[PDB]
């Protein structure tokens, strides 16, 4: 019995297994990683020995994800995660590589929140039990699952087209649309609000916080269909489903008072989603 990654690299106590993730919202649970495309095992003596592999209780997330509960799909069936009991067995009865049919999910706890996971960091500590139908061999070992690429795991029922958006305005004056859409695994009554450092009493102009050679007299103002969106004011999108819906935002310049002088302009504006 032996296992390898999607890279073909053999999985060796404990082993560090690096996998690629494509996290995503599903209905009622969010995918963290589908390990069935990442981990493959086989049987070295299938004509005389059948191998069995289970997921032992105590298997759980690690790193930034250790705070979240969810589920594990093991060989087509769902179990609480962290696991509280041993799963049924997967059988390996062939020399040909077969997937380790495991997918790790997260219970949605936000509207459209996300947790950044960087490459090289631990996402899960999995405990396996290996037996056979031939002798009394019964051993446990640990697989530490590491991310092999930078991702963001969605923690909500909805997800965005991008977590970090950089837009460039034309030289003053001028406007640029902000590319940003949202969708939900199932239909949700969804809204959003802006936050950031504002310059005016009406909280309608985000301050020019450019560090190097900043301009004077101007800030950034966002509109939606020609209407000013002030900070901390919920924009309703109505019911949002699986079809991507634009937030409908456009960036503009706006005068903050006094003489307008040459220099750089920058504003960092947060978007936060809420259920309505």
């Amino acid at each position: 019995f032996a296992c390898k990654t999607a890279n073909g690299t053999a999985i060796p106590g404990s082993a560090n297994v690096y996998v690629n993730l494509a996290p995503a919202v599903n209905v009622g649970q969010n995918l963290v990683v589908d390990l069935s495309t990442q981990i493959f095992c086989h049987n070295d003596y299938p004509e005389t020995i059948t191998d069995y592999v289970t997921l032992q209780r105590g298997s759980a997330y690690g790193g930034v994800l250790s705070s979240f509960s969810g589920t594990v799909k093991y060989n087509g069936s769902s179990y609480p995660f962290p696991t509280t009991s041993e799963t049924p067995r997967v059988v390996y009865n062939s020399r040909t590589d077969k997937p380790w049919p495991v997918a790790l999910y997260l219970t949605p706890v936000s509207s459209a929140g996300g947790v950044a996971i960087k490459a090289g960091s631990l996402i899960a500590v999995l405990i396996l039990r290996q037996t056979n139908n031939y002798n009394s061999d019964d051993f446990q070992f640990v697989w530490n699952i590491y991310a092999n690429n930078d991702v963001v795991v969605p923690t909500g029922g909805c997800d965005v087209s991008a977590r970090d958006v950089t837009v460039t305005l034309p030289d003053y004056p001028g406007s640029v649309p902000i590319p940003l859409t949202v969708y939900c695994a199932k239909s949700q009554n969804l809204g959003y609000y802006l936050s950031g450092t504002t310059a005016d009493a009406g909280n309608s102009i985000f301050t020019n916080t450019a560090s190097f050679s900043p301009a004077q007299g101007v800030g950034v103002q966002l509109t939606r269909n020609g209407t000013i969106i002030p900070a901390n004011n919920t924009v309703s999108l109505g019911a949002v489903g699986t079809s991507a819906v634009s937030l409908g935002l456009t960036a503009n310049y706006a005068r903050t008072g006094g003489q307008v002088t040459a220099g750089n302009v920058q504003s960092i504006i947060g978007v936060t989603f809420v259920y309505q």
Binding site: D171, A251, S267, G270, V271
Partner: peptide, 12 residues
């Protein structure tokens, strides 16, 4: 915030 928008501009 769930998304961070950085808006860059220039006055010439």
């Amino acid at each position: 915030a769930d998304v961070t928008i950085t808006v860059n501009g220039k006055v010439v």
